[PDB]
């Protein structure tokens, strides 16, 4: 093979089918691992009297001659792991008095001969894990008093009888984790003194075994993945030197109030699923904890003496309990992370977190905390993260928070106070409840601050309207709409003598668009009063009734105008076809009522108008009330399509002219100015297309109230009826 100078022959992977020859007799480590050897002939190793480590790890070995391993009295380590031995080679390994380690873990061993392991007076490491045996070889193991490590992990041992390991007085480590163990007798672990590691992880344990009481020197115990539910008090009486318990993923119900008593060297305790536990465990005598974790229980209190002891405590997880009050955390100078989420916490006292240096992460999420003291963080050390999400807060302290890096207040909707960026100098990731509160931080000064609710353009930091262009456009549109609609209404209602249906529709449409003019004027005046400081007024405007009033005004005006246009087209169709003033007035009243109901629908709903200071629901909001937006868009489309097809049929079947021209102008302009509003309303929900929020807001502002400032000018300067009625008014006033 590949002979080596250090007398360590490595024949791995050579593919030979026998014991290699032509090797120095003074070799001390022979490796025949990966090749294919199926049997060891008699006196196979007669040429290696000084062999010390034999590794047959990987051959398809299936038979060993009784005299094959004879004469290797200097052998110390033997490895036969991945072969296909069907049983422990009892007769093959006889006489190897100097053997100290045996690997048989991966064989397909199904039965251990009774007289096996005879003469192995120096054995100290045994591997039998991944075999398939049903019972612990009690009698074969009774002949190995010097054993110090045993593994029967992946076997199929159903249970362990009494006095199985009686003579293993020097055992140290026992691994039975992935075994299919279902029960353990009271005296199974008998005589296993100075045992420092026990693994029973994936067994099918029903209850907690009582054999542990016979392991006075246990240090690490693993029974985490069993089907254990009950851990009665006193389960660790006979283990004063215990240091580690693994009890995760086993569904527990009751763990007892005194399970972990006077455990001096325990350094961890993570209990999950203990639903029926409602009292804090008796931790007296356990003062070396590092991380304490009691997640799922019904605990409602914490002993005030918690920090008097356990000075080494670092992590405190008490989340899924129902904790109302909080004691004083004075002490616990090494306490690092605190989780108090999903409890029911009413108020934070001033001295709860007094001192307590090195406290970095403190979670207070999902707790109905309506009161936080003003100076509950002045005496706190370097605290990196701070989350108070979903806490129903009414105010927030400022002192001592400059060192914060990440602060989260996502769920505190009632927190309407304005935060100050003068304090959170080092703040990096802020999550305010309302997007207006993060204006002072210049969302996306001294550093870069990332705000979770994006400010964007739909939440104007300084100017609701935007640039001077949009400002003056909206200003003059509102002025024209209001003044001309008022003048048209005055001229129309000065007479109150002639009431043709077409002029009735004209007057009603003017009235409807007057409300849109009024709402645009409200927006302009709000922008004028709040110049550069609109983010301050944003929360007030959204949460106040002004948003509801504006949203109503706008929606009612739009729907009233649409319904009036539809009914005017219906009347024109009836006139073309061939007395009906009463039914037309009734239809107009019904349309007014329907528009009022449509405008009031968001008032019945919750938060539809709160999408933006525009307070128009569907343009700036697409996901909330998406069904309502779709229904209103479809209704508007149906009305426009019906009026369009009626007009088309009228012009087809027909060759008062001013009324026809005004109806045509009105329908064309209304369709032209109404399509982009719906398109931009549905724009954000379309993933494929991306439109800037500034453009969306400008388009909405310049398109929604356009008919209000357009139609009265048309009616005034596109009809001699205006001149005739003005002469009539002049005669009336003179």
């Amino acid at each position, epitope marked *: 093979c590949s002979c080596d100078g250090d007398r360590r022959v490595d024949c791995s992977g050579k593919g030979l089918t026998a014991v290699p020859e032509g090797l120095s007799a003074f070799t001390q480590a022979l490796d025949i691992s990966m090749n294919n050897i199926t049997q060891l002939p008699e006196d196979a190793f007669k040429n290696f009297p000084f062999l010390e480590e034999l590794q047959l790890a990987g051959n398809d070995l*299936s*038979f060993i001659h*009784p005299k094959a391993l004879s004469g290797l009295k200097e052998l110390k380590v033997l490895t036969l792991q991945n072969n296909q031995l*069907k049983t422990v080679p009892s*007769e093959a390994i006889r006489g190897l008095s100097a053997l100290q380690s045996l690997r048989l873990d991966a064989n397909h061993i199904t039965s251990v001969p009774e007289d096996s392991f005879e003469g192995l007076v120096q054995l100290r490491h045994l591997w039998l894990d991944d075999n398939s045996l049903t019972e612990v070889p009690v009698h074969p193991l009774s002949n190995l008093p010097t054993l110090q490590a045993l593994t029967l992990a992946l076997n199929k041992i159903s249970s362990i009888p009494d006095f199985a390991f009686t003579n293993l007085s020097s055992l140290v480590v026992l691994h039975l984790h992935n075994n299919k163990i279902r029960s353990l007798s009271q005296h199974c672990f008998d005589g296993l003194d100075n045992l420092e590691t026990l693994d029973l992880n994936y067994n099918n344990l029903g209850e907690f075994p009582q054999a542990i009481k016979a392991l006075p020197s246990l240090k690490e115990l693993g029974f985490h993945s069993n089907s254990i539910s009950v851990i009665p008090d006193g389960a660790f009486d006979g283990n004063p030197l215990l240091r580690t318990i693994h009890l995760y993923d086993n569904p527990l119900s009751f763990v007892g109030n005194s399970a972990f008593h006077n455990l001096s060297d325990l350094h961890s305790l993570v209990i999950r699923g203990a639903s029926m536990v409602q009292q804090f465990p008796n931790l007296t005598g356990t003062v070396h904890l590092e991380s304490l974790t009691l997640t799922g229980t019904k605990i409602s209190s914490i002993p005030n003496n918690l920090c008097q002891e356990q000075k080494m405590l670092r992590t405190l997880d008490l989340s899924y309990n129902n904790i109302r009050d909080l004691p004083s955390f004075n002490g616990c100078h090494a306490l690092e992370e605190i989780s108090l989420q999903r409890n029911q916490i009413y108020q934070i006292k001033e001295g709860t977190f007094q001192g307590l240096i090195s406290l970095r992460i403190l979670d207070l999420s999902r707790n109905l905390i309506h009161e936080i003291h003003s100076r509950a963080f002045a005496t706190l050390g370097p605290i990196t993260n701070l989350d108070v999400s979903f806490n129903e807060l009414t105010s927030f302290p400022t002192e001592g928070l400059n060192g914060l890096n990440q602060l989260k207040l996502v769920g505190n909707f009632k927190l309407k106070e304005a935060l100050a960026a003068k304090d959170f100098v080092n703040l990096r990731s802020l999550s305010v409840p309302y997007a207006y509160q993060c204006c002072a931080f210049w969302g996306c000064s001294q550093i870069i601050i990332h705000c979770t609710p994006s400010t964007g353009a739909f939440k104007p930091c300084e100017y609701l309207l935007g640039s001077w262009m949009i400002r003056l456009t909206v200003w003059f549109i509102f002025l024209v709409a209001l003044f001309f609609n008022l003048l048209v209404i005055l001229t129309t209602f000065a007479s109150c003598t002639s009431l043709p249906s077409s002029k009735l529709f004209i007057g009603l449409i003017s009235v409807s668009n007057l409300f849109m003019g009024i709402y645009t004027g409200i927006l302009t005046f709000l922008d004028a009063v709040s110049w550069g400081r609109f983010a301050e007024f944003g929360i007030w405007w959204e949460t106040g009734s002004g948003c509801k009033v504006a949203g109503f005004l706008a929606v009612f005006s739009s729907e009233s105008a649409i319904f009036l246009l539809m009914l005017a087209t219906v009347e024109r169709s009836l006139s073309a076809k061939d007395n009906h003033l009463k039914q037309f007035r009734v239809a107009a009243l019904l349309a007014f009522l329907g528009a009022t109901v449509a405008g009031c629908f968001p008032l019945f709903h919750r938060g539809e108008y709160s999408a933006s200071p525009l307070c128009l629901p569907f343009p700036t909001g697409e996901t909330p009330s998406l069904g309502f937006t779709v229904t209103l868009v479809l209704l508007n489309s149906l009305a426009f399509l019906l009026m369009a097809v009626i007009y088309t049929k009228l012009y087809c079947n027909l060759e008062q002219s001013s009324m026809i021209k005004h109806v045509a102008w009105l329908i064309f302009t209304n369709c032209i100015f109404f399509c982009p509003v719906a398109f931009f309303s549905f724009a954000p929900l379309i993933t494929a297309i991306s439109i800037s929020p500034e453009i969306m807001k400008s388009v909405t502002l310049i398109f929604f109230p356009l008919p209000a400032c357009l139609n009265p000018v048309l009616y005034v300067f596109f009809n001699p009826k205006f001149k005739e009625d003005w002469k009539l008014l002049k005669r009336r006033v003179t």
Partner: nanobody, 108 residues
Framework: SLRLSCAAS????????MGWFRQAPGKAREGVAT???????IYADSVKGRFTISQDNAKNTLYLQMNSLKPEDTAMYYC???????????????????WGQGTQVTVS
């Protein structure tokens, strides 16, 4: 049909748990018949009925008679024995302390 004959030429006394094994090419050795010192016999599932065993301590000879040889019987046959006692008999190959040279048998 053949009668394999095995002789304990150098054995001193007390033949304890003799047996017969067959080996396939490049495979493990499987027991076909085990005879205890009390005359009790243990036969393989694919063997019982077809084969018979007989031990005579007067000549210390073990005879394994074979009949109705199916082509699955072609293998190298060995006889194995264990002088020192203290273990339970069976078809395991890890208990016998002495093995024969074995003859190749094929259907003929």
């Amino acid at each position: 049909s053949l009668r394999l004959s095995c002789a304990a030429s150098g054995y001193t006394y007390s033949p304890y748990c003799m047996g017969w094994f067959r080996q396939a090419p490049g495979k493990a050795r499987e027991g076909v018949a085990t005879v205890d010192l009390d005359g009790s016999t243990i036969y393989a599932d694919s063997v019982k009925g077809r084969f018979t065993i007989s031990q005579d301590n007067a000549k210390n000879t073990l005879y394994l008679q074979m009949n109705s040889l199916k082509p699955e019987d072609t293998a190298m046959y060995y006889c194995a024995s264990r002088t020192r006692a203290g273990v339970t008999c069976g078809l395991n190959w890890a208990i016998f302390s002495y093995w024969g040279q074995g003859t190749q048998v094929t259907v003929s």
